[PDB]
Amino acid sequence: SALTMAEYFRDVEGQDVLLFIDNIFRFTQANSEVSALLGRIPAAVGYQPTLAEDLGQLQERITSTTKGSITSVQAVYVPADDITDPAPATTFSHLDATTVLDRAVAESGIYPAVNPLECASRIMDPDVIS
Amino acid sequence: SGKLRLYKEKLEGYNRFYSIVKTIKMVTLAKYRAAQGRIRTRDFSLRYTE
């Protein structure tokens, strides 16, 4: 629903819009809850088999086209601090800038608890930045 | 899975520990190999000191 509102502002109004989402994981979690009652065999860990396709359709809609631009900031919950989990991992390929927070950093009094060795950015290239 | 990787991280630490400790052995062995010479040249300076 919110993405549809942003798309209208992007296309019809031709404006540069911001889109904040918190939390995008719950979209996957909710579909997993209903997946069992829809007669679908659970996949690994216990998510729905359609985890990758459903998230991809939503993510591809969140993009900047020739008409307008959408700057999207999405918060991803890494269950039990396990970044190997299917949901957090599936969301890494659909992003231009990943900010990975670590509990150990926060416990040391460092805020924001960013682990720079695990973060990445697409524009970290000399051609784009100075 | 995190639980499995918890052991893997734990075993990862022990591996580096072995390497560093082995490096310590290399250092001491060199010092002992060069300090082994005194064994030849001792037991004669302290004669009238007795």
UniProtKB/Swiss-Prot annotation, chain A:
It comes from the Eukaryota. This is ATP synthase subunit beta, mitochondrial. The chain holds residues 261 to 390 of 519 of the full protein. Belongs to the ATPase alpha/beta chains family. It is found in: Mitochondrion; Mitochondrion inner membrane. F-type ATPases have 2 components, F(1) - the catalytic core - and F(o) - the membrane proton channel. F(1) has five subunits: alpha(3), beta(3), gamma(1), delta(1), epsilon(1), plus the additional subunit P18 (Tb427.05.1710) that is not present in F(1)F(o) ATP synthase from metazoa. Subunit P18 (Tb927.5.1710) interacts with the alpha subunit with a 1:1 stoichiometry; the interaction is direct. Subunit gamma is part of the central stalk. F(o) has three main subunits: a, b and c. Mitochondrial membrane ATP synthase (F(1)F(o) ATP synthase) produces ATP from ADP in the presence of a proton gradient across the membrane which is generated by electron transport complexes of the respiratory chain. F-type ATPases consist of two structural domains, F(1) - containing the extramembraneous catalytic core, and F(o) - containing the membrane proton channel, linked together by a central stalk and a peripheral stalk. During catalysis, ATP synthesis in the catalytic domain of F(1) is coupled via a rotary mechanism of the central stalk subunits to proton translocation.
